[PDB]
Subunit: 149 residues, 12 copies
C-alpha cells in the first residue's frame, strides 16, 4: 500500500491512555489525543492519514498488526511495556513482509531501569526512535512516508 | 481516599479462580471465594469495604488498576504468574501516584523455581508479603487500613 | 477422560492463524486450516476427535486450559510465542493433574534466536516435539492417544 | 508447643539498635524499644508473650535461634544485613523442625540496592514480610499466632 | 538414498544398553531390545528398515554417523549423555548434508538437571522429540518416513 | 543558544568518510558529502545552520564536543564505533549541561552484532535514532531545532 | 610442630553443636561428642592428640586458627556455613604458612543447594573432604598425621 | 555386595598412566603402579580386594562402570579430565543404584584453573576427596570398606 | 566534631593483628603496632589524636562504628576480609551521617583474587585508598583532617 | 631516576581540562590549573618537581607514559574515562618495569555507574586512590616521594 | 628431539577424514590426503619428516600425544571439535614438557558459533593458527622447525 | 591488485615501538626494527614489498587502514591492545572488501589475562596467528602472498 491509498496504523500499548497525567518530567504533559492530533497533522503534511489506537492487551495489539499488514501502509508502534516482554508482538511484526515499521518510545529507555534497556520490537522495527518525546511519533510518521512512496 | 469512602481494590491474576482444587501442600485448601470472604471480614474490622476481583488477562488487570486509580483507597494484588512477567502491571501501579499497594503471595516464591524469585510488581508494591498463605491478603488489607486512614 | 469419551484440546498461540502465508521454509505451506485437518485425521485413526482452537491472547489460552482440565482428554499445544514469555500458560497447565499434555513446535526453536531456545511450557508439558513440521501435531495426537488409554 | 505456653522469640540483626535516629523516610520514626512495644501489644492481642532481642553478632543470633528451638514457640526475625550474607543464620533456622518462622523487612528490600534483593533467610522462613514498616512485625506475630496453634 | 532402498540408522549413546534395569519412573520398563523392536515395527509400517546400534563411545558414534551419510536414508539418534557434551557428534551430523536426522530423548530434558537442558545435536537435528518415552523413537522413524519418502 | 544565534554541530565518528562506498544494503548509497547536504537543507528548513564534521580520532571528537559546548546550540552525533567503546565521548557529552544532544545511527544497531546493541552515548543523548538511515540525521536536526526553540 | 609435640586442632563451625538431633539422612546420628571421640581415637591411632572445639562465631573461629598456628601441628576444619561466606577464615588460614589444613564436609556439598558448592576454605586448605560422613574427620586426622610426622 | 565377596573397582582416567614423571609439585612422584600398590594395601587391611584400571577412553570407563555395577562392591574413581567434561560417566554411575562411589582427585581442583573447579562425577559420588595426594585413594578405599559393610 | 575534640577512629579488620608476621612481599614488615604509631603521628601533625582498634569479629566492629558515631571526628577503616563480605559494616557506616569515612587497603586489591576486587565498604566510604602500603592509613588520617577541619 | 634527579610525570585524561567548570558536588570547584599548583606545591614539600599534563587522546597519553618511562621519577595518573576503557594505557604503564605508578580518581568511582567501577589501570598502578577529591593527587605525589626518594 | 632425528606428529581430530567432501566455502576444496601431502612437503623443506594421523576418538588422540611425547620433535594439531570439549587432550598436551605444540584450525573459529570461540588446547599450544586455510598447517610445520631447530 | 602491484600494509598498534626492551620471555628480544627487517625479507621471498608502520593511535591505524583499502595488496596487523577494545579498527577492516587481512599476536593471548582472550579484529581478519612469536608476521606475510598473488 501507499500513503495515498491507505492509512499509517499508529499503535499504542499499555498505560498510554493515561499519558499526560503524570511524570511529565519523563513523558511531558501532552495527552494521548494530543499525540494522535500530532499524527494526523504529521500524515496530512505528507498526503496520508493515520489510524490511531491504544490497548492494554497484547493479543489485540497483535490482532491490529494482523489488520495493518493487510490494510495499512505502515506502522508506527509504541509497544510501551510490551516493548520489553512481548515476543508475540515481535512475531506479529515479523509476518509484516516489507510493510515498514517504526518503534517509538517517548522516554529514552537506555537511561532508565535495566529491564527497560532491551526491546523485542527493535528486532523487526526498521527504525527506532527514543527520547524524542511525542515528536518521535512525528518522526515515525515522516519515516513511514519516506519509505512507503 | 479513606477506608470509609471507598473499597480496597483486591485483584487476582491467572489461575487463581482455581484456588482450592489442587496442590494443598503449597497453596492450601481455601478457595478464592473463601479468600474473598476473609478480605470482606478484615476490611470491615477497620471501617472498610473491598472490590475483590480475579482475571487471567494481563490487560484487564491493567484496565482495573486504571479503575482503582480513581475509585479506591488502595490495592491488594496477588499478580500470580504475572508477577514474574508483567512489566505492564508494574507500569500500571506506577501511574497510581500516592496510593498504597500491597503485593501478596500465598507461597514463599523465594523457596521455589528461580523465575518465581523475581516480581516486577515488588518494584512498586509498597509492601510485599509472601508465603503467609491466604492470611497474607489479610495483612494486605490490614496494611492498606494502616496507610489509608 | 479417555479418547473415545472426550476430545483432545488443540491449542495454538499467537500469529498461527496466519501460517502458510509466508516464510514457509521455516513453517511449511500448510494453513492453520490444513493443520486442523491433519489433526481431525490423526485423532480419528485412534478413535478420537479434537477441539481445535487458536488465540492471540494469553488469558484466552489460560481460559481454554481451564476448560480442557474439565472437559477433555488431553492437550496438544503450540504456544507459539508464549512458550517463551508465559509463566501464566505454564501455571495453567500445572493445574492439570494427570492430564496428558504435549508441547508442539513446527520449527526447531533450538536453532533459532537465542531467546526462543527456552520454553516455559516445557517445564510441565509431558512431551515436546520440535522441528518435526506440522507433522509434530500428528505426533502430538499420537502421544495423547497412547496416554489417554 | 502452643502460643499459650512459650514466648515467641523476636530477633533483630545488626544496626537495628539505632532504628529511629535516621532515614525515617526508609525505616520510620519508631525506635526498637517502640517496635518491641508493638510486639508485646501484638502478641497479647493473641494470647501470647514475646522474648525480644537485638544483636550485631552473627553468631549470637545463631545462638539465640538454637535457644528458641527448645524454648520458644515461634520466631519473628529481621536479620537486617545478615539477611544478604548469613548462611549461618539460614542453617540455624534450618535445624528448626516444625517451628514457624516469619522473616521481617521494614523496608522493601526489592526496591533498594541489588545486593539487598536476596535474603538467605528467605530460603527457610515460612512467611517473608517486607516494606510493611514496623507494622511488618505485627504481621510476623499474627502469623506465628496463627500457626503456633 | 531413499526409504525404499536403505535402512534407517538408529544410534543410541552411552548407557542406553541398560535402559530398563532401573529408574522406570523416568525411562519406562522397556529394554534396548524392546525399543529396537518397536523401531522394527514403525519402520515397516511406513515401508522401511532399520540399522539399530548402541555405543558408549563418542568416537564410534561419529564413526557410525559417517557411515549413515553414505549407507543409510537417515538418522534417529538418542545421544544420551553426549547430547549435552558432544560437539564432535554435532559436527558429524553437520557432514550429513541433506540427510534427515531426528534427535530423541526418552525423558523430558527440560524438566531435569539444568545441564541437561542444552543439546549440541539439537543444533543440527531437523526434528527433536523429547519426553515422549520410547514412543519418541516411533515418531522419529515416522518423520524419517515422511522426509525420506 | 538557538539555531538563530548558533550552528548545530553535527559530529561524525570513524569510517563515516567512506559512507556510501560498499554494503549499500546496510548504510546505503548516499555519501558523507550527500549526508551533510541533507543536514544543510534540514537545518535551513528550521531557521538554522550546521557545523558538520567527521573524525576517526576519539580524542578529537571529544575536543569537538567541547567547542560546541561553548559555541553551538546543539549536537547531533553519529559516534559510529565509538558509540560502543567510548567512555571519553559520553563524559564529553556530560560536560554539555543544558545542551540538547541527539544520537543517530544509520542502521538499526539492535538488529546487528550483539556488541553493537549497547551505546555509551545513549546514557546522555536526550534522544537516539537508529535504522532510519540518513533520514535519521534529519530527525536529529528536527529534534535539535525543536528543543532549541 | 609434630603430633608428638603438639595437638591437631579440630575446628567446627556453626550449628554443628546440634549435630545428632536431626536430619540424619544427610548428617547422620553421631553427635558432636561422638565426633570428638571419633577424632581422639584416630589421632591416638596414628600417634597424636586433638584440641577439638566448636563455635557459631566467625571471629572466634579466626582467633582459634591463630592459636593453632603457634601451638598446634595441623588444622582439620568443618567451617559449616562459614565455608561459603567467610573470607576471614580463608585469610586466617593463609596466615598459617606450611601449617597443614584439611577441610571437612560431613555432606557432599556438590549435591546440595548451589550456594553450597563453593568454599572459600577450599582455596587454601591443603586437602578438602566432602560427603564422607563423620568419617571424613578421621581422614583429615589421618592426613595431618601423614603430613606432620 | 560386601567387601568379603567382590573386589573394589579402582578407575583412573586419562593421562594418569604417566603419573609420577612431572609436576611432582602437583601430583607427586608415586606412579600408577605405586598408587595401585597403596590400594592393594588399603583394601587388604579392611578385608578386601581391588580391581585397578586406567583408560584414556571415556566410553571404556563407562563399560567398566557398567561392569562394577554387577561384579564389584564399589567404585573409587579418579576421572581425571573427564570429571569436568563427562556427563556420560556421571550417568554410568547414576545407574548403579545403592553402590558406594567415592571420587578422588590427587590435586586440590579448587586451587587450580576455574575449568577444574567443577566435576560432573561429584553429583553422584557419595564422597569426594580432593587435595589429599595419592593418600586420597586410601581414604576412598576406607570409605568404601566402611560402606560395603 | 573536629580533630580538636574527638579522636579519629581507626578500625582494623580481621587478621591484621598478625600484620608484619608474613608475606611482607604483599603487606610489608611493619607490624600493626608500627601502623598505629604511624597513625598517632599523622594525627599529631594535624592537631589530632587517634583511637586505634583491631578486631576479628564482624560484630564488635559494628559496635565500634556505633561508638565512633557519637564520639569521634571521622573513621579510617581497613575492613580487611570484611570489605568483601560484610553488608553490616557497610550499614553500620551508613549510620554515621556526614561523618568522614576513608577506607584503606594495604595491598592493591584490584590485582588479587577476583573475590578481593569488590568492597561493600567502598559504597559508603567517602574515599578509598589501596596499594599504598601502610602509608595509606596516613593518607586516611590526612583526608579526615582535611574534612573534620 | 629519582625525585632529586627527575620530575614526577603527572598525567590527566579526557575532559579534565574542564575541571571546576561544572558539577562541583561531584568533582569540586578547583580547576586543573588549581590542581597543578597543588602538585607543584605537594612535590616541593617533599624534595621534588612535577611535569603536569592533560590530554583527551588515548595515544598521546601513551606517548607521554613512554616518555616518563625514560625521563621522570614516577607517574601519578588520573586516566579519567580511559581508566575504564584503555588496555593500551595499562599496557603502556606495564612497560615501566620498576617505576612507581599511582592511580587517582577524584570521585569515588565505586559509588557511581557500574561501568566506572573497574579500571584497567588498577591492574598495574601500584597505588590507587579514589574519593579523596583533588587531595588524592597530593597523596599520589606523597606516594611517589616515599617510593622514589 | 630435532627435525633431523624425529618426525613432527600431526594429529587430526574428529570428522576431518571428510575434509574435501563438503562446505569448501568454509573448509576448502582439498582433502586430508591433500593436507597430509602439504605437511610432508613443508617438513621436507626444513629437512624434517611428519607422521600424519586422523582420529574421531578422543582417548586415541590422547594415546598418540603420549606417543608423540617420546618419539617426535613437535606436535601440530587440528583437534577440530575436541578443541572445544577436551580438557583431556589439553592435559595430554600438558604432559609434554619442552615439546613444541602448534594448534591449527582451518576455519576462523572466532567467526563461528560462539561455542567455537574457545579451545582448551590453546591454553597449552605454544602457537595457534586459525582460518588461514590448509595453509595454517604449513605455518605449524614451519614453527615446529623454528623451535625444534 | 596483486603482490606484484602493491606493498603489503603492515600495521603495528600501541606500545610495539618498544619491542625488545622488556618481556623477552613473552615477546622476544627482537626490536620493532628487527621485526620490520623480517617482514621485508618475508615479502621479497614471495616477490613482494612491505609498507611497515607503527602507531599508538587508534584513529591513525584507522586512517592507515583506509589508505590500504586504496593502495596496498593486504594487511598484516598486530593490533596490540586495540585488539581488545577497538570496534573502530574492526569497522576499519570491515570496510576492506576482498582485501586479505591477517591478525598477529606475538604472545598467545589465550594463555594470558582473560580480557586478552577476546579481540574484535578477529571477527574480520581472515586469519589470526598467535603465540608464534614474530615468526607470526612471516606467516602473516606468507598468507597474504598466497591470497594476494
Ligand atoms: O518511554 C516510553 O515511550 C515507554 O515505551 C513507555 C512506557 C510507559 C511506562 C509507564 C507509563 C506509561 S503511560 C503514561 C505516561 C505518562 C503518564 C501517565 C501514563 C508508559 C514503558 O512501558 C516503556 O518502558 C517506555
Ligand atoms: O528493611 C529492613 O528491615 C532491612 O532488613 C534492614 C536493614 C538495615 C540497614 C541499615 C541500618 C538498619 S537499622 C536502622 C535503620 C534506620 C535508622 C537507624 C538504624 C537496618 C538492611 O540490612 C536490610 O538490607 C533491610
Ligand atoms: O532421555 C534421554 O533419552 C536422554 O538422552 C537419556 C539420558 C540418560 C541418563 C542416564 C542414563 C541413561 S541410560 C539408562 C536408562 C534407564 C536405566 C538405566 C540406564 C540415559 C541422558 O543421558 C540424557 O540427558 C537424556
Ligand atoms: O549504523 C550506524 O550509524 C553505525 O554507527 C555505523 C557504523 C559503521 C560501520 C562500518 C562503517 C561505517 S562508516 C561507513 C559506512 C558505509 C561505507 C563505508 C563506511 C560505520 C558502526 O560503527 C555502528 O555500529 C553503526
Ligand atoms: O556437611 C557439612 O559438614 C557442612 O559443613 C555443614 C553444614 C550444615 C548446615 C546446617 C546444619 C549443620 S550442623 C547440624 C546438622 C544436623 C543437625 C543439627 C545441626 C551443618 C553446611 O553449612 C555446609 O554446607 C556443609
Ligand atoms: O588431581 C587429580 O587427580 C586430577 O583428577 C588429575 C588431572 C591430571 C592432569 C594432567 C595430568 C594428569 S596425570 C599426570 C600427573 C603427573 C605427570 C604426568 C601426568 C592428571 C586433572 O585432569 C584433574 O582435574 C585433576
Ligand atoms: O590489603 C589489605 O589491606 C586488605 O584490606 C587486607 C587483607 C588481608 C589478608 C590476609 C591477611 C591480612 S593481615 C595479616 C598480614 C600478614 C600476616 C598476618 C596477617 C590482611 C585482605 O583480606 C583484603 O583483601 C585487603
Ligand atoms: O573520578 C574521576 O576522577 C574520574 O577519573 C573522572 C571522570 C570524569 C568524568 C567527567 C568529567 C571529568 S572532568 C570535568 C570535571 C568538572 C567539570 C568538567 C569536566 C572527569 C571519569 O571519566 C572517571 O570515571 C572518574
Ligand atoms: O576450522 C577448523 O579447523 C575446526 O577445527 C574444524 C571443525 C570441523 C567440524 C566439522 C567437520 C570438519 S571437517 C569436514 C570438512 C568438510 C567436509 C566434511 C568434513 C571440521 C570444527 O570441529 C572446529 O570447531 C573448527
Ligand atoms: O602479543 C601481542 O602481540 C599483543 O598483540 C601485544 C600486546 C602488548 C602489550 C603491552 C606491550 C606491548 S609491546 C611491548 C612488548 C614487550 C616489550 C615492550 C613493548 C604489546 C598486548 O596488548 C596484546 O594483548 C597482545
Amino acid at each position: 500500500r501507499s500513503l495515498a491509498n491507505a492509512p499509517i496504523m499508529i499503535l499504542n500499548g499499555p498505560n498510554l491512555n493515561l499519558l499526560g497525567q503524570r511524570q511529565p518530567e519523563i513523558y511531558g504533559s501532552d495527552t494521548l489525543a494530543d499525540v494522535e492530533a500530532l499524527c494526523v497533522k504529521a500524515a496530512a503534511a505528507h498526503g496520508g492519514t493515520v489510524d490511531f489506537r491504544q490497548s492494554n492487551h497484547e493479543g489485540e495489539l497483535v490482532d491490529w498488526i494482523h489488520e495493518a499488514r493487510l490494510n495499512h501502509c505502515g506502522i508506527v508502534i509504541n509497544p510501551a511495556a510490551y516493548s520489553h516482554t512481548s515476543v508475540a508482538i515481535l512475531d506479529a511484526l515479523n509476518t509484516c513482509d516489507g510493510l515498514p515499521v517504526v518503534e517509538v518510545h517517548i522516554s529514552n529507555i537506555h537511561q532508565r531501569e535495566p529491564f527497560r534497556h532491551h526491546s523485542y520490537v527493535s528486532q523487526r522495527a526498521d527504525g527506532v526512535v527514543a527520547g524524542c518525546g511525542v515528536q518521535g511519533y512525528v518522526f515515525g510518521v515522516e519515516r513511514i512516508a519516506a519509505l512507503a512512496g
